[PDB]
Ligand binder design. Structure first.
Ligand SMILES: NC(=O)c1ccc[n+]([C@@H]2O[C@H](COP(=O)([O-])OP(=O)(O)OC[C@H]3O[C@@H](n4cnc5c(N)ncnc54)[C@H](OP(=O)(O)O)[C@@H]3O)[C@@H](O)[C@H]2O)c1
Ligand SMILES: NC(=O)c1ccc[n+]([C@@H]2O[C@H](COP(=O)([O-])OP(=O)(O)OC[C@H]3O[C@@H](n4cnc5c(N)ncnc54)[C@H](OP(=O)(O)O)[C@@H]3O)[C@@H](O)[C@H]2O)c1
Ligand SMILES: NC(=O)c1ccc[n+]([C@@H]2O[C@H](COP(=O)([O-])OP(=O)(O)OC[C@H]3O[C@@H](n4cnc5c(N)ncnc54)[C@H](OP(=O)(O)O)[C@@H]3O)[C@@H](O)[C@H]2O)c1
Ligand SMILES: NC(=O)c1ccc[n+]([C@@H]2O[C@H](COP(=O)([O-])OP(=O)(O)OC[C@H]3O[C@@H](n4cnc5c(N)ncnc54)[C@H](OP(=O)(O)O)[C@@H]3O)[C@@H](O)[C@H]2O)c1
Ligand SMILES: CC(=O)N[C@H]1[C@@H](OP(=O)(O)OP(=O)(O)OC[C@H]2O[C@@H](n3ccc(=O)[nH]c3=O)[C@H](O)[C@@H]2O)O[C@H](C)C(=O)[C@@H]1O
Ligand SMILES: CC(=O)N[C@H]1[C@@H](OP(=O)(O)OP(=O)(O)OC[C@H]2O[C@@H](n3ccc(=O)[nH]c3=O)[C@H](O)[C@@H]2O)O[C@H](C)C(=O)[C@@H]1O
Ligand SMILES: CC(=O)N[C@H]1[C@@H](OP(=O)(O)OP(=O)(O)OC[C@H]2O[C@@H](n3ccc(=O)[nH]c3=O)[C@H](O)[C@@H]2O)O[C@H](C)C(=O)[C@@H]1O
Ligand SMILES: CC(=O)N[C@H]1[C@@H](OP(=O)(O)OP(=O)(O)OC[C@H]2O[C@@H](n3ccc(=O)[nH]c3=O)[C@H](O)[C@@H]2O)O[C@H](C)C(=O)[C@@H]1O
Ligand SMILES: CC(=O)N[C@H]1[C@@H](OP(=O)(O)OP(=O)(O)OC[C@H]2O[C@@H](n3ccc(=O)[nH]c3=O)[C@H](O)[C@@H]2O)O[C@H](C)C(=O)[C@@H]1O
Ligand SMILES: CC(=O)N[C@H]1[C@@H](OP(=O)(O)OP(=O)(O)OC[C@H]2O[C@@H](n3ccc(=O)[nH]c3=O)[C@H](O)[C@@H]2O)O[C@H](C)C(=O)[C@@H]1O
Ligand SMILES: CC(=O)N[C@H]1[C@@H](OP(=O)(O)OP(=O)(O)OC[C@H]2O[C@@H](n3ccc(=O)[nH]c3=O)[C@H](O)[C@@H]2O)O[C@H](C)C(=O)[C@@H]1O
Ligand SMILES: CC(=O)N[C@H]1[C@@H](OP(=O)(O)OP(=O)(O)OC[C@H]2O[C@@H](n3ccc(=O)[nH]c3=O)[C@H](O)[C@@H]2O)O[C@H](C)C(=O)[C@@H]1O
Ligand code: NA
Ligand code: NA
Ligand code: NA
Ligand code: NA
Lengths: 346, 346, 346, 346
């Protein structure tokens, strides 16, 4: 459910706003809360086409479609009036497009987040959850750097805003299995096309999680985050060399593998918690919570006092979590209805 | 000199603008070009006090003092008219202040750099060199993240602007020995005060370079960078445990060492070139040049083609350069007139 | 071709920018010029997903993908540098979404067009063609009103800018057969679903044209418009009552028709030239050209001098063009490969 | 009075703000409420001269004069603090000047109205009445188009703002007899000058109303409008051919008539309610009220549900109201003290 064990709220008078509400998570998150008592789900984005498609498929009078842009504080303010909860998912999230147009990544991902927070605070929103990415930890490309900076901005706002006024937190997650354009659909299309599998670096690792796991992480933050927290779902990882084998064996196929090399903008492994975040985090079980440090603007934490737990820690990354076996990758692959349909169809 | 072997220019009709011109580098860079043929050095910053101090100390009619703010495109445009060269050194550069006010770090370091580039291009400036920091490689604090994003922005502008119109490049350097507030003056003050040396993590490493080495790196970029390049000076490093010993032996002092632990916002070692940058860089000798990739907006470099040299490389960092011995640290320490004066005086 | 009879240009050194370049026309217009000598086609829009899809389908090194927003003059300026020709197709074009968020329609369709024109003029673009709609003539809904105002803005700019500097014109067209969401796909889906055809007002008329006819109109303006002109393609029309019959007979189907009534925001017939435009227009044959009036800011044309040709004229609309017979509608329907495939498949 | 039969309010603690407060309506509306209990009437405009003239003529300590511009939200906010009621009359309202400078018409009439509404809402104003024009229905010139778009903007704001917070409505009226520069003073001046009457199109019709009728319409909206309503006063009309005869017979004059032809930017007849507005309106008697449709952002009203009452209706225009006889035009002309004085004086 959407509510901790031993609570209830009833969302029967509550309004959820989803920025970037037409994209993959916005939709999965939308479709989760449609399974609820919620009075209204406002879908806020720039794109009238994607909005009309969703409207017509769901025909649900809970859904309201707002045209607007996180870059524009007036357009956010219109959609934010009377809102209780915000899932902030609006972003430029593709690596190459942020790398070539990084000022657009700063306008949407960094300034656009500050506008959403400022409007949410003015409108007395109860909670804002900002979506981020493992590419924001030790980042190397403009998309991850802009997301890392977005995290600093929402953490900084949480220090100066009381929790009871507006609680502000965020989620960072790994690689969503079978994202549009991502490596699983790519490889399947190569299997079916009779093409070789283009492997970048077979020993490269990525955290592996489903879209459903990604929605649970947001719900987990919605229920349990404190203001300033970054919530991360613990996740296993796969090497690309093993993921490709898993798919080949499942599809009973003997397409060759071709090594194309590491592409620009990519790391060998992804980090979900930096050394410092790990040192400071609380283990919630299937999640880590990274609380905001120095909530009173405690300069001396950066200057004159240290923490030996930081020196003693190391980062949480896709090399040091459980790296799945080919068998495990297969089982996890088979929980996806995308893989099943393609499989049956093959 | 300011000109490659086998060239001359004469700067006798040339105008240099230094944003952040009143800070430590701006001044050292200013005082280098005062040693030149340059027609005019404009010092651009926000602070009328620091400007008046410099004016009165130098009394040099080459120096012109402009009040203005990189955040404001009109104020930059006033100072940029008729300029040939820009050293862009304006920045919020202190870790804690960027971490608590990251929107100010985005306004000055990222948006302020885009305003300087746009104005330089409109005014037909020949070259703009942007100063950056090893904290921008795999960054973990808001100051390094904003500087990493500044680098993406100037690299992106260089792809879309012809070199012959305006050449745009930047420099990244390590820890400047005996910066205001930095660990060498701190430890000396503890030596002289009879206080214990507060060591954060004795095995922490930082690249070690002088302010003079930092000015040479900027001059090196001024002379040799191509548009889009990031230039880094190769540098040795010290552990903090060894730097403290070097100072203690020099000062013939037996203050105790106290371990305070790693402070927030700090890494164990600093990186000057990421894995990818190292793979792509050219070794100029005492420098590496990191050329801009995908200058034609080549998406396919991020998506469908890879580079096996990236897979084969690793990052250039303060653990894997030459880590100096206590003896070496001492010799390097003694090249500083700050250390000498304090030493004699002790 | 893209060039008048008795001319040649060679577009071999030329750059075309398409704002809204990922939408239906942008693409058809893009795919037309791919059939040409053109050096570069820049696709400018806000959406990185749609851009990546197009890139990957075409794999054509002429295509460059710019992320940006017509609302933001800096982001337009980046994409406009070195451009020769602009097809301005960026717009919020859905009736309900403009009616509920008309300030967003004013920001994109009116202010966004002024930013494109101002940037094109600063960058010495040769020609800008602005796309408009018959809903802008005697308009009744916020989408048509914003498009009518966009036309006034580009006409006003053409009076004050010399043609040899930048030529600025626009196109207005009717209902594109088999647009996403439009009545032909709707009715086909009802045919195939066994559902009744929902007819709004069977005697309602709309101009009928194909997407290919729409691209020709833009090319016609590209080749022949003078600055300030509005170009309209003459077109026949259908009643909805007749279009529905045409589809039923083609699909050899006897789904019932249900009258739902006129929807909000709709006219009984659409106008392509107002009384005044018709009075002033030149007949180019399959097109009318509406030249800009009062090019010297001739107030007296609105105040003290009149034109008896205006009094004598009437508007050009979907009731007074050739209204096609069911047979004609069928023949025109069959020129569409969308209709053919659906037909065969049925 | 200013209050419905069976109510009272006492305006003894109330503050009225009139934007465009120095123009013809602002003044007539001002002079109406001076005839009241109102605590304060603030006159808001840009022009210090017109403000000083009014101040000095009335010498009334209820009148306060604010300099400011509807284009500037801070300047509106200063004048809006503690306001109860707003009559928004600020506008660029001349046809040629909007047609040549339509971006100025969009800044004042559309964006300026959104700033007034946003400030009124922030300041807890009770009611805002926006003045519009029959030129906004099926509009053909930039002035009417900007006013049509202003109406969409205030209607859209009324859907998202509760009535009890701020009620937002508007008025549309026809041709005010003996406006500065309008056809009645023009013709009188020709009568007195011995010049021929320049008639544009003698069969052209315009709604005829006095300034006093125009103030009553605003008061009617003030008392009875609901949020989102457009209120129109029913009105008879005159042909220009008949108005000219009426004036000639009254002035016992035989100046010839010259036909100059229809001028740019003019329709043959003006519309006060479009087909759709008429279908949806309630007849209040001497007024129609057009309520806002789809107050819950009901997309389906534009897309999947229709209204047969719309199909069955037609527009309310100056051809289909009561067209007055020459005798009627004369009687109505004689109710004007402007006509009387000119008449006696002749
Ligand atoms: N691969 C992944 O799925 C993944 C992994 C880690 C983190 N994340 C993060 O989770 C969030 C959503 O992920 P997703 O996969 O759902 O992304 P997605 O499908 O691309 O959705 C994000 C949505 O952002 C909207 N948007 C973009 N710019 C906007 C603006 N300026 N104003 C308002 N809306 C805007 C877009 O919709 P319109 O075109 O309709 O405006 C888009 O559909 C993003 O913040 C992303 O960083 C995603
Ligand atoms: N420790 C180091 O020295 C070190 C190491 C690596 C990289 N760097 C980089 O090198 C550059 C300069 O280093 P530095 O040590 O000379 O720094 P610094 O002494 O702090 O000087 C930077 C100058 O920036 C100016 N400034 C700040 N905001 C500005 C704005 N909004 N508009 C115009 N001027 C502004 C300030 O002068 P006013 O107060 O007069 O405006 C300040 O003196 C910075 O970009 C820094 O990131 C420094
Ligand atoms: N039914 C018709 O086809 C029809 C009829 C008459 C006239 N027209 C006109 O012709 C033009 C294009 O028609 P179309 O059918 O190709 O429309 P469309 O497919 O919706 O394409 C327009 C494109 O506008 C882009 N866009 C929207 N806001 C933008 C912004 N703020 N900055 C940059 N790009 C933006 C969108 O792409 P992103 O989401 O990638 O930004 C969208 O794909 C429009 O002006 C429309 O008014 C169309
Ligand atoms: N013929 C008619 O009378 C007629 C018919 C139908 C509708 N209307 C509408 O009714 C309203 C007023 O009619 P009216 O005849 O009283 O017009 P008017 O006498 O021209 O008065 C409008 C006032 O607008 C003020 N104004 C213009 N731009 C402004 C800005 N940017 N900020 C603040 N004030 C501004 C001007 O005063 P300053 O120069 O002192 O700023 C002007 O006196 C207008 O909205 C008009 O559209 C008029
Ligand atoms: C370039 C780009 O668009 N990256 C988007 C993407 O980020 P990630 O790179 O993490 O995901 P992927 O599914 O593409 O790589 C999976 C693994 O397979 C490897 N990979 C990938 C493609 C391939 O052909 N071969 C291969 O081995 C690859 O090196 C990696 O080890 O996905 C999300 C949606 C984004 O935000 C980014 O814009
Ligand atoms: C999960 C559980 O209940 N185990 C408890 C049990 O620990 P385990 O036996 O699991 O071994 P570890 O914790 O040493 O490393 C495991 C993984 O975590 C990550 N981990 C660990 C340390 C670190 O600094 N950074 C980090 O990412 C890294 O991915 C690494 O590979 O004891 C320690 C002291 C605890 O507090 C745990 O909650
Ligand atoms: C917090 C802060 O203001 N950091 C500024 C600073 O960045 P860095 O941290 O790199 O420099 P430092 O000279 O302070 O540390 C040197 C080494 O000594 C260690 N160090 C430092 C102080 C101490 O008491 N003990 C100690 O061991 C320390 O852990 C490290 O290993 O200097 C420049 C000017 C900035 O931009 C930053 O704002
Ligand atoms: C400096 C010179 O002239 N040496 C040449 C001679 O090399 P050396 O014997 O010096 O050993 P290496 O290059 O293996 O590593 C040295 C350091 O560089 C850094 N280095 C090296 C590789 C890398 O991927 N990343 C990196 O940072 C890292 O700090 C590491 O510790 O041969 C290789 C192949 C060259 O091309 C050199 O120019
Ligand atoms: C509401 C809406 O989104 N209108 C978009 C649309 O504008 P138009 O209305 O002109 O097109 P359509 O294909 O929908 O109507 C065709 C005719 O069939 C009639 N029509 C339509 C649907 C139906 O179920 N029944 C019916 O008779 C209808 O009354 C009309 O007589 O198409 C383009 C793409 C847009 O810009 C607008 O946002
Ligand atoms: C097309 C051609 O070559 N015909 C020439 C031949 O004309 P036709 O016999 O075709 O009859 P018409 O022009 O009277 O009306 C036809 C349609 O046009 C539209 N039309 C016409 C007049 C008008 O004011 N508005 C208008 O929209 C309206 O859709 C109407 O139903 O003589 C006149 C005087 C010309 O100048 C023409 O070029
Ligand atoms: C051009 C211009 O400034 N039009 C302003 C104006 O809008 P309207 O045109 O409605 O008013 P008018 O009194 O001028 O026309 C009355 C009738 O007499 C006819 N008319 C007018 C002048 C003439 O010489 N002869 C003539 O027959 C004329 O064709 C029409 O049939 O008045 C208000 C104040 C505005 O907002 C507009 O800016
Ligand atoms: C005013 C009154 O009390 N008459 C009532 C009495 O009506 P009347 O005998 O007056 O004839 P009508 O209503 O047919 O047309 C009159 C004028 O209105 C305008 N009118 C009318 C219909 C329309 O769709 N649009 C429109 O503008 C147009 O200007 C047209 O010329 O019966 C109908 C059904 C009513 O509901 C009325 O309230
Ligand atoms: Na707080
Ligand atoms: Na370049
Ligand atoms: Na011109
Ligand atoms: Na409301």
């Amino acid at each position: 459910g959407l509510v901790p064990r031993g609570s209830a709220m009833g969302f029967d008078d509550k309004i959820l706003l989803i920025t970037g509400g037409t994209g993959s998570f916005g939709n999965a998150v939308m479709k989760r809360f449609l399974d609820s008592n919620i009075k209204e789900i406002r879908i806020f984005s720039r794109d009238e086409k994607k909005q009309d498609d969703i409207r017509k498929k769901y025909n649900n009078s809970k859904l309201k479609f707002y045209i607007g842009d996180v870059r524009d504080s007036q357009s956010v303010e219109t959609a934010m009036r009377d809102v209780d909860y915000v899932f902030h998912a609006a972003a430029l999230k593709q690596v190459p497009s942020c790398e070539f147009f990084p000022v657009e990544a700063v306008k949407t991902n960094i300034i656009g987040t500050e506008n959403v927070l400022q409007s949410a605070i003015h409108q007395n929103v109860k909670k804002v959850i900002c979506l981020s990415t493992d590419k924001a930890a030790y980042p190397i490309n403009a998309m991850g750097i802009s997301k890392a900076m977005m995290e600093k901005v929402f953490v900084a706002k949480s220090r100066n805003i009381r929790s009871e006024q507006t609680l502000i937190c965020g989620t960072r997650y790994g690689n969503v299995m079978a994202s549009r354009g991502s490596v699983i659909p790519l490889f399947i299309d190569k299997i079916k096309a009779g093409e070789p599998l283009t492997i970048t670096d077979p020993d490269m690792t990525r955290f592996l999680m489903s879209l459903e796991d990604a929605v649970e992480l947001v719900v987990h933050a919605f229920k349990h985050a404190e203001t300033g927290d970054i919530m991360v779902q613990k996740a296993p990882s796969s090497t690309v060399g093993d993921l490709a084998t898993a798919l080949l064996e499942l599809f009973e196929a003997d397409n060759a593998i071709e090594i194309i090399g590491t592409r620009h903008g990519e790391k060998k492994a992804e980090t979900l918690l930096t050394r410092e975040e790990y040192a400071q985090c609380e283990d919630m079980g299937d999640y880590f919570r990274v609380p905001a440090d120095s909530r009173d603007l405690n300069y001396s934490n950066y200057v004159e006092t240290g923490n030996e737990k930081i020196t003693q820690s190391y980062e949480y990354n896709s090399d040091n979590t459980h790296i799945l076996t080919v068998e495990e990758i297969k089982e996890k692959l088979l929980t996806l209805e995308y893989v099943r349909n393609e499989l049956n169809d093959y």
